[PDB]
Amino acid sequence: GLSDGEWQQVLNVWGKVEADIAGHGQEVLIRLFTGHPETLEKFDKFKHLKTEAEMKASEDLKKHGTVVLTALGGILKKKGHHEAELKPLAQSHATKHKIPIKYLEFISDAIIHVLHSKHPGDFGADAQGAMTKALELFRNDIAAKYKELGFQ
Ligand code: HEM
**Domain residues for 59?**
1-152
Return all residues near 30 (Cβ < 8 A) that are at least 6 apart: 52, 55, 56, 61
Annotated ligand binding at 116? The verdict is no
Q: What resolution, expressed in A, was reported for this entry? A: 1.4
User: Comparing C-alpha atoms, which of 128, 137, 115 is closest to residue 19?
Assistant: 115
Indicate which atom in ligand 1 lies nearest the CA of residue 104. 27
Residue nearest atom 35 in ligand 1 by C-alpha distance: 43
Q: Is 67 in the pocket of ligand 1 (CB under 6 A)?
A: yes
Q: Which amino acid is present at 105?
A: E
* 93 Cα to the center of ligand 1, angstroms: 7
Method: X-ray
* 123 Cα to the center of ligand 1, angstroms: 26
Count of domains observed in the chain: 1
Name the residue of 17, 49, 60, 68 to mutate for ligand 1: max ligand atoms within 8 A of Cβ.
68
Burial category of 144 from C-beta neighbours within 10 Å (exposed 0-12, middle 13-18, buried 19 and up): exposed
User: Comparing C-alpha atoms, which of 120, 58, 82 is closest to residue 2?
Assistant: 82
Indicate which atom in ligand 1 lies nearest the CA of residue 88. 16
Cα 142 to Cα 10, 22, 28, 103, 135, distances in angstroms = 19, 24, 20, 12, 11
Q: Which amino acid is present at 73?
A: G
Query: 6: helix, coil or strand?
Result: helix
**Residues 142, 89: contact at Cβ < 8 Å?**
yes
Q: Is 92 in the pocket of ligand 1 (CB under 6 A)?
A: yes
User: Comparing C-alpha atoms, which of 70, 152, 126, 19 is closest to residue 134?
Assistant: 126
User: What CATH number is attached to the domain comprising 23?
Assistant: 1.10.490.10
The Cα 22–Cα 126 span in angstroms is 25
